[PDB]
Structure formats: structure tokens, C-alpha cells
Design a protein around this ligand. Structure first.
Ligand code: SF4
Ligand SMILES: [Zn+2]
Ligand SMILES: [Zn+2]
Ligand SMILES: [Zn+2]
Lengths: 698, 335
């Protein structure tokens, strides 16, 4: 198609010249473009030069990229008849890419890597001075396994079944195949991870093309890289962890103190560099991204052992308890907090080097490690590494006392996001940035400063198949104003709005998905609604996303949606744009043909974080009180707009309330503003015009 | 030859005010007219009317070739209010129960007038779709306004995987057009199998009524058909003799056969400035200029219709008339 062909030419010229490009792709028709453009762009140079580094935000997009990549393999193998070196490595979740926890553990928690470290330590201990090896090991590093992938694609599911048949473990296959430089499909939380980005950065060996897919929550991921809430219980886990460290000190000092002195000599002689250069296949700890930290010559507590580290650690956690037991409102400057700490007790600005080393020493002296104590020690260790370094833009904040019991909390505020993304513009080039929910695309040259080119979407045809109306008059124009407050006002008006949702849902009974700015309105209309005929006549049942989302509940709600729409029933999907699961799988009538939006998206205000980042961005780009109520809400609404668009062969309609939507842009800017009662008959005609123009335009 | 099962939606959704005065009355009336036209262009065909009311499928007109039974059965529906909800699965299962005794050499058609946007079925309708496709049953759905995915999968699955039979109606005239489309047969590409039937009687007409006679009802008559096999004098219809099971056809089978054999050759439009012949029609007589929108640019041009199988001239009204009825072109009878 010519429209996507233009984006192919843009990707070509930006990959051949520019080092980074902001490309705006139309929603639903821009996923398969870059996947083939990158491969052909690799074949025109020479077959193995740059590799695809596709980055998504969810796992569903990773699976879609895997099956579409398989469509690329079949596409290139069915048109030429020649077999080439296949690519495609599926890097997914650790719990989903492991087989043993499904045989004995029967758990899908985040502690599967700890059990994997127990098995790996079992292998190392059966190869040194002596649990079993695991299920199958010692044959995952051979050439045959290194060639099972280039000869045949085994990614994720095919790798899970292939490992279940060939009696292998997929974790070491993927880990050993990161250096093979295949098409890696991982998420943003792995490229910028203060524990994963280092090893991945050391295995990919750079020199590739990075593809930022749906790069609209990049600031959200850079924010989520820090901010850890200290909620008084971590102080108890740190106290019990310090007691466990004292017991371990009594154990290593009781009988076996030679290994601690030998490793201590390894620290005095070769320091952290030798300690990390000698150990292989050993569990590591957290770090504030060593490539971004750039701090060498880590001295081990001014050349000291473990008793001094646990003494200064007890003093440090006691100082933390002292700083967390205060009045109520108090803000901290990370420099003033470090100076106050120095006034309490001298410890200098080197507890970072004192944590990254002592944690590894304790690991080298521990054989039975408790998970909660070690986890709390890793939390306090991260807090130390981030009060010792990284201060520009960092802002320690104490949550106020609001009952005062449920209160002693201390959160650290992260720094400028440009710093975190920075290394990719030295490691790499021609980083393609594609997103279908960006409008306007000027807040990415502004916020996050980087020199790039701007390419907007140039595809807009068959406007009769993309019904895009907006509702302004709700029959009284009183719910659009009351539906914009943080706390709802006049419950009777909200009940009238819900009645309007009952009338609208009754008018168009063909799959409805409703998005809310928060769960307060949902919990207010679901308690006592004075009506339920929509569930009793057209919808049979209603689908509600819990304010505390669950994986199995959401999965049963989505499968219930597909089966309900495949039985000719339909169901209303009351979800939150700010909640979990942003979806993205459409291209069928099983999804909501009509989508309802309750006003415009809103972010929770009256929070210390929004004021800290508010004044920070105010000092940075001077975009105060203007972009945090239109850019974020524009992205959250665009997440709902992207679900309506699903190819030109399909149709749909999305109703946006509130006049304030005119102040923001939108994908395909062709919108007509009228009432809701008129939109009922208008949609009643569109449900037939969309069915008439299909065979006429074909 | 054909066996159509008319399944009308008769639920609460039909009580709405779309058609005038409501959807139910217009669907019933247009269904009566569809019975008239269907039994006019298909004499030896079979019909069976089922309604979807109260969440159940109710057979209101048994499979028969007499139109009066269907007429009365349709008159009884308009005297009650359509209540309940439609059930596509029960209607398709009962339609299966009515189409199974039909021989394989006769087509099995199910015409569903679906006005509601939702159905109430007990079991999984996809299994019923698999059963319909397995036993070869063509299903055509005339839906109201918005589309239903189940109707798409049903009409597409029951027609060799081709989708062009789930017709959307937007007005009374459109519903009339679809009704008319169900009169005409559908010579599809098929799957290439064997076909033939044997034993078709031709009757002798008995005018005697002094003592009267009846072998199918034992009542008084004014004359009746004669079976050339069991030699019974029954009520007159060109359908099957109910005394030994064989047809009683006459010139009606020839009529519908020739109607299914009509090529309907559209005559080519040639301007008078290109044909160089005087304004003439061979079925009547036309000295009328067809084109005259402008001055001399259109008046002196006109339009003469041409049958190329005889090189003859005709006017438009006669092309339309010979396309409606009669064999095409009188000039093709003179050599
Ligand atoms: S070797 Fe594989 S199966 Fe065994 S614990 Fe490690 S990841 Fe799990
Ligand atoms: Zn007989
Ligand atoms: Zn004429
Ligand atoms: Zn002729």
C-alpha cells in the first residue's frame, strides 16, 4: 500500500542518514512496516551488520512481534525457496521462560530467579567441592544449542515446547543467545533496568538499531526506574536483616573465618573489579547502572571487613528510622540530607562503593540466604547508592502524616529522564522511534532534549469508514462539568449521567467498551444505579475491571468478552485508562465496535510527586500548569483512540465527552461536535452506511 | 425443486417503530406477497413458515406446496403481538427437521428475516452451523440495520465460504427487493455431483361432478386431476400425487424451466448518428427521440437499441418488457 510505502521510504532514509527519527505511524496499520523495512535494510547493506532491537511496553506486543516476525520468515522463505540464517530470539518473563517452577513450585511469583540461582549454585557446588544440578544442564552451552536457533526459529512458545521435548532449559539458551545477536524482543523495563541493563548492555555488545515501539510512556518508564516508598515495615525488615547479619557474623567468626579473610585479601588487593572479575554464574545485587555511574576504584570500607560494615549499617538504618520519625510535612534536599547524616556520623559519600562490594562479599560467604532480610538489605543498599550519588534533579521527600499511624513513609524522587536515556545515543545510531499515540509530536523534542527529525502521519483516506464524532450536549450539559472534578459532586447528576450511559448502551447493543478517568465514578455508579435493564436485555452480563486488577481476573474478563461477542451477546467493559492492560489486539468484530469515554482523562493532583516534577519541569522547560493536564490526558485518551482504529477494512465509533477535547489534538483530525441524542440516530445510520459502503468500495 | 424455510423474527424488538406502523406488520404483509411471487415463479416448490417467539421456534406452516396454508398461517401472526426473544438455533434445528426428509436432488434453502440485533440460543450456535454446512443447507439472512457477526459467519459458511448473502435492509423498499431476490433461484458453482429424478405423472382433467369424488379428502368437488398411475381423482395441484407419490406436472414445469433458461440478452445502445437507420422499434413503433437534453447536440443524436442476434432496432420500454416477460426479441424468430 502506498501510504505505508511512504513510511517505508522514511524509515529507509532515516536509517541511512539520521541517527534518530520521530516517526508517527497510524494506529493499526503501522506494525508490519518497520519489521520488514529493517530486515530489507539489513539485506541491502550486507546480511549481518545491524540487528533489530525491538522494544515494546507490554508482552502482548512482544508476542505480536514474534508471530509477525514468523510471518516475515515464511514470507521470505516462500517467495525465494532459499534458506538463510534465521533470527528471532524471544526474551520474555523469567517465570514464563522456565520449566521447573511449574513441576514442583507451582508458583508464578518474582522469586523464580532465586530458585534458579539455587540450581546454578548447585551446579557450581557440584563442580567445585562436591541440591541436584536441576532438570537438565551442562549441555546448554554447546554448539548444537547455539545452532538450534539460526537453523530453526524457536522463540518463546516454540522455545518452551522445544525445550520441553529436547529436555533443555530455555533461560541459559536465551542468555547464551543474547551474544548471538539475534532479533531480541524485550520491553523498556529491560533496556533501562538498574540490574538487567548492565548485563544486556555487555552481551549485545552495542552496534545495532534500536526500535522504540509505542514510545509514549518513555517518561513513565524513566520515572518508574526510581521512587521506592519506605513504609515503616522496611525498617523492621532492615532490623531483622541486621540481626541476621550479626548472626552470620557470629557464624563466620565462630569456626570458619579463613574464607572471609581470603576474600578480604582479594578485596584489599583487587577490589570490586577483581571480585566481579573472578566470580562467574553467581547471583548479583542491585546497582545504580554502572555504565551511567562511572565510578571505579571501589575501596571496601576504607579497607575494612564485615563487622564494621554491619556496624555502620546499623547506624545507617537507625539514622533512617530517626529521619522517618518526624512531625508530618518535610521535604529533603539530597545534599542537605547527606550533610545532616555527616553531622550525625561520618560515613563520607562512599557508602555506594561500600554496598556494591559488601553485598557481594556476604553473597560469597552465604550458603543459606534468607530472602526478606537480603531483600531489605538490597533496598537500604539502593537508598545508600542513591543518597551517595545522583543528586541533580533527585529530591528526597517524606510523605506527610495523615491519619497518626499509617504514615512513616519516605520516597525518593528521581532525576532528569534525559540522563537515563542518554547512553543509547553514544552506544547506537539510527534509533527509530515509532508511536501511534503521539499528537502533537513536539513534546518529545521539547521534553527530553535530543536532536532528531520529525515525521508526522501522512495517511488519511476513506473518512466514511472512520466515524469520529464527539458528544458535547448530554441533554442538559450538566454531567460534563461534574464529571471533571477529582472528587465527584452531586451524586444525582452522576446518576443521570449513568442513565445516559444506559440509554446510549441500549441504542447501540454491539460490543461496548467504556473508559473512565478513575475508579471512583465506577464504584459510585456500581453501588446503587437504580437501573439494570442493559444487563437484562442487551448485554446479558457486564465486565468490570477491578480497582485492584488481577491477572487471572482480567484474562477471564477478556476471554469472557471474546466468547460473549462470539455468541451474539456483547458486554460492556468498564475499564480505566489509567489502570492496567492498555490492550492493542483488535482487527475483528469481537472488540467493541463502539467505544465510550467518560469525559477526558485526569491525573491525580494534590500529590507531592506532581508538585516536585511540576516545579522541576517548570525550571527545565517552563511548561508549568499547561502540559500536565493536556499531554498526559492526551496520551491516556489516545490509548483509547488506538483501540478503535484497526485497519481500513473495519469501522468503529468513539464518543468523547467534554468540550475541552477541542483544546487537544487527535489522530485523524476529522471530528464533528453535536449532542448525544443526535449521535444516537447518527450512529444508528452509521451502523448501516458502514455495512453498505464495504461491497461498494470493493 | 426448491424447499425454502421462511423464519420470521417475532420478538419484542419487532414492536419498535421503524417501519410503518411497525416492523411486524410490514414483515407479515411482505411475507404474504413473497409467498405469492414465490408460488407464482416456483409452482412445484415447497415452503415452510417458522416463527421465533417467546424464546422458542414455532412452526406455523408445515412444508407444503399449497399457498393458501401459508397465507392463513401468516394471517394468524398479525393478530398477536410479537413477544419474547428470537432463537436462531431452535429455528435452524427445526428447519433441519423440515429439510432432512427432502431428497438430496432438491435444494435446501432457509430464509431468515432477522430484525433484532441479538438472539437467545440454548446451545452453541457454531455447532448448528457445522451441522448445516455438513448436510448442505443454504442459509440467507436479511438483517435489519446493524450487522451481526454470527449472521456473517452463518451466511458465509453456508455458501461455500463466500460472503454475499447476509443482506442488510434499510427501508421497506429494500426489504421488498430482497424478498424479490429470494424468488429467483441461485445457480451457484456447486461442487460437481450427480443429479436426476424419475417418475413424473401428467394428469387428465376430469370435469365430472354429478356424483363428485375425492381420494385425498373424500369431499365434494367440481372436477379433479387424474393420476396416470394409481388412477385416483384428487384435488388439483401440479405437485405430488398423495396416493402413489409422483408428480402431476403440466405446462407449469415447462414454464419455470424456460424462465430458468432465459438468457435475457440486453440490447446494445447505439446512437442514431452511428447506426444510420431511421427511428424504429420492431415490437411496436417508435418515432420518439430518446436524447434531447441539449439543443441540436442531443436532439439529433437520440438512442436506438440493437439486438445483434438479428440486427434489429428497439426502444427501451420494449427491452425492459421483453426482459420482464416473453422470450427475447421477436426478430430472432424470423430468419
Ligand atoms: S536451570 Fe532452568 S529450569 Fe533450572 S532453575 Fe534455572 S531457569 Fe529454572
Ligand atoms: Zn398417484
Ligand atoms: Zn417499442
Ligand atoms: Zn434478435
Amino acid at each position: 500500500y502506498p501510504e505505508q510505502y511512504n513510511y517505508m521510504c522514511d524509515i529507509k532514509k532515516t536509517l541511512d542518514v539520521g541517527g534518530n527519527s520521530i516517526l508517527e505511524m497510524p494506529s493499526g496499520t503501522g506494525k508490519t512496516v518497520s519489521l520488514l523495512s529493517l530486515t530489507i535494510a539489513y539485506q541491502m547493506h550486507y546480511p549481518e551488520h545491524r540487528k533489530i532491537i525491538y522494544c515494546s511496553r507490554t508482552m502482548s506486543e512482544i508476542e505480536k512481534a514474534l508471530v509477525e516476525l514468523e510471518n516475515l520468515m515464511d514470507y521470505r522463505t516462500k517467495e525465494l525457496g532459499y534458506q538463510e540464517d534465521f533470527r528471532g530470539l524471544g526474551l520474555t518473563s523469567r517465570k514464563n521462560l522456565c520449566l521447573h517452577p511449574e513441576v514442583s513450585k507451582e508458583r508464578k511469583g518474582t522469586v523464580v530467579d532465586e530458585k534458579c540461582r539455587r540450581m546454578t549454585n548447585g551446579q557450581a557446588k557440584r563442580k567445585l567441592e562436591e541440591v541436584e544440578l536441576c532438570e537438565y544442564h551442562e549441555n546448554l552451552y554447546n554448539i548444537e544449542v547455539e545452532d538450534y536457533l539460526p537453523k530453526g526459529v524457536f522463540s518463546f512458545e516454540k522455545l518452551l515446547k522445544y525445550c520441553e521435548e529436547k529436555t533443555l532449559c530455555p533461560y541459559f539458551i536465551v542468555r547464551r543467545m543474547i551474544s548471538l545477536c539475534n532479533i531480541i524482543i524485550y520491553s523498556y523495563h529491560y533496556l533501562l533496568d538498574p540490574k538487567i541493563a548492565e548485563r544486556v548492555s555487555n552481551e549485545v555488545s552495542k552496534d545495532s538499531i534500536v526500535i522504540f515501539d509505542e514510545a509514549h510512556n518513555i517518561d513513565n518508564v524513566c520515572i518508574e526506574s526510581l521512587s521506592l516508598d519506605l513504609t515503616t515495615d522496611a525498617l523492621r525488615r532492615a532490623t531483622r536483616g541486621a540481626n541476621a547479619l550479626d548472626e552470620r557474623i557470629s557464624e563466620v567468626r565462630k569456626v570458619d573465618s579463613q574464607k572471609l579473610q581470603d576474600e578480604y585479601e582479594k578485596l584489599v588487593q583487587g577490589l570490586x573489579x577483581x571480585x566481579x572479575x573472578x566470580x562467574x554464574x553467581x547471583x548479583x545485587x542491585x546497582x545504580x547502572x554502572x555504565x551511567x555511574x562511572x565510578x571505579x576504584x571501589x575501596x571496601x570500607x576504607x579497607x575494612x571487613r564485615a563487622e564494621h560494615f554491619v556496624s555502620f549499617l546499623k547506624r545507617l538504618i537507625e539514622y533512617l528510622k530517626t529521619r522517618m520519625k518526624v512531625l508530618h510535612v518535610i521535604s529533603e534536599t539530597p545534599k542537605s540530607f547527606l550533610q545532616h547524616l555527616k553531622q550525625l556520623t561520618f560515613i563520607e559519600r562512599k557508602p555506594l562503593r561500600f554496598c556494591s562490594e559488601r553485598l557481594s562479599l556476604l553473597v560469597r560467604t552465604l550458603e543459606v540466604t534468607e530472602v526478606e532480610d537480603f531483600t531489605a538489605l538490597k533496598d537500604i543498599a539502593t537508598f545508600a547508592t542513591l543518597i551517595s550519588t545522583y543528586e541533580e534533579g533527585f529530591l528526597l521527600i517524606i510523605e506527610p502524616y495523615e491519619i497518626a499511624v499509617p504514615n512513616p513513609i519516605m520516597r525518593f524522587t528521581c532525576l532528569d529522564a534525559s540522563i537515563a536515556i542518554k547512553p543509547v545515543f553514544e552506544r547506537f545510531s539510527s534509533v527509530i522511534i515509532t508511536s501511534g499515540t503521539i499528537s502533537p509530536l513536539d513534546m518529545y523534542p521539547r521534553m527530553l532534549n535530543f536532536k532528531t527529525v520529525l515525521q508526522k502521519s501522512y495517511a488519511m483516506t476513506l473518512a466514511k469508514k472512520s466515524f469520529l464524532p464527539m458528544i458535547i450536549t448530554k441533554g442538559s450539559d450538566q454531567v460534563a462539568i461534574s464529571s471533571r472534578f477529582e472528587i465527584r459532586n452531586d451524586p444525582s447528576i452522576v446518576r443521570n449521567y449513568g442513565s445516559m450511559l444506559v440509554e446510549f448502551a441500549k441504542i447501540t447493543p454491539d460490543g461496548m467498551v467504556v473508559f473512565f478517568p478513575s475508579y471512583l465514578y465506577m464504584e459510585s455508579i456500581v453501588s446503587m444505579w437504580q437501573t439494570m435493564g442493559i444487563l437484562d436485555e442487551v448485554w446479558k452480563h457486564k465486565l468490570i475491571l477491578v480497582e485492584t486488577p488481577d491477572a487471572q481476573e482480567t484474562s477471564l474478563a477478556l476471554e469472557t468478552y471474546r466468547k460473549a461477542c462470539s455468541n451474539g451477546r456483547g458486554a460492556i467493559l468498564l475499564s480505566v485508562a489509567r489502570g492496567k492492560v492498555s490492550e492493542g489486539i483488535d482487527f475483528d468484530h469481537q472488540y467493541g465496535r463502539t467505544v465510550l469515554m467518560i469525559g477526558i482523562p485526569f491525573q491525580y493532583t494534590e500529590s507531592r510527586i506532581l508538585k516536585a516534577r511540576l516545579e522541576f519541569m517548570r525550571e527545565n522547560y517552563r511548561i508549568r500548569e499547561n502540559d500536565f493536564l493536556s499531554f498526559d490526558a492526551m496520551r491516556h485518551a489516545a490509548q483509547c483512540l488506538g483501540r478503535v482504529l484497526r485497519g481500513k477494512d473495519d469501522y468503529g465509533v468513539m464518543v468523547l465527552a467534554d468540550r475541552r477535547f477541542s483544546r487537544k489534538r487527535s489522530q485523524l483530525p476529522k471530528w464533528i461536535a453535536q449532542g448525544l441524542s443526535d449521535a444516537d440516530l447518527n450512529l444508528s445510520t452509521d451502523m448501516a452506511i458502514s455495512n453498505t459502503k464495504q461491497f461498494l468500495r470493493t | 425443486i426448491r424447499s425454502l424455510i421462511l423464519t420470521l423474527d417475532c420478538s419484542e424488538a419487532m414492536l419498535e417503530k421503524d417501519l410503518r406502523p411497525n416492523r411486524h406488520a410490514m414483515i407479515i404483509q411482505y411475507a404474504i406477497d413473497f409467498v405469492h411471487e414465490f408460488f407464482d415463479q416456483n409452482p412445484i416448490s415447497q415452503m415452510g413458515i417458522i416463527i421465533m417467539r417467546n424464546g422458542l421456534a414455532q412452526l406455523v406452516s408445515q412444508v407444503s406446496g399449497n399457498p393458501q396454508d401459508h397465507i392463513d398461517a401468516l394471517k394468524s401472526i398479525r393478530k398477536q403481538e410479537p413477544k419474547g426473544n428470537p432463537s436462531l438455533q431452535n429455528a435452524l434445528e427445526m428447519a433441519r427437521g423440515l429439510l432432512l426428509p427432502v431428497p438430496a436432488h432438491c435444494t435446501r434453502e432457509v430464509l431468515i428475516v432477522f430484525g433484532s440485533l441479538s438472539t437467545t440460543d440454548p446451545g452453541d450456535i457454531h455447532q448448528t452451523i457445522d451441522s448445516l454446512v455438513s448436510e448442505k443447507i443454504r442459509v440467507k439472512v436479511l438483517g435489519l440495520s446493524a450487522q451481526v457477526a454470527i449472521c456473517k459467519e452463518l451466511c458465509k459458511a453456508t455458501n461455500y465460504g463466500d460472503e454475499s448473502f447476509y443482506k442488510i435492509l434499510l427501508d421497506e423498499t429494500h426489504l421488498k427487493e430482497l424478498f424479490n431476490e429470494a424468488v429467483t433461484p441461485x445457480x451457484x458453482x456447486x461442487x460437481x455431483x450427480x443429479x436426476x429424478x424419475x417418475x413424473x405423472x401428467x394428469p387428465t382433467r376430469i370435469f365430472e361432478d354429478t356424483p363428485t369424488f375425492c381420494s385425498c379428502h373424500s369431499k365434494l368437488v367440481y372436477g379433479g386431476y387424474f393420476c396416470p398411475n394409481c388412477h385416483s381423482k384428487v384435488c388439483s395441484l401440479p405437485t405430488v400425487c398423495p396416493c402413489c407419490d409422483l408428480m402431476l406436472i403440466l405446462x407449469x414445469x415447462x414454464x419455470x424451466x424456460x424462465x430458468x433458461x432465459x438468457x435475457x440478452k440486453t440490447f446494445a445502445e447505439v446512437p442514431t448518428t452511428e447506426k444510420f437507420r431511421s427511428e424504429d422499434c420492431f415490437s411496436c413503433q417508435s418515432r420518439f427521440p430518446x436524447x434531447x437534453x441539449x439543443x441540436x447536440x442531443x436532439x439529433x443524436x437520440x438512442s436506438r437499441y440493437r439486438c445483434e442476434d438479428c440486427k434489429q432496432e428497439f426502444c427501451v420500454d420494449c427491452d425492459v418488457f421483453i426482459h420482464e416477460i416473453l422470450h427475447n426479441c421477436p426478430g430472432c424468430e424470423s430468419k
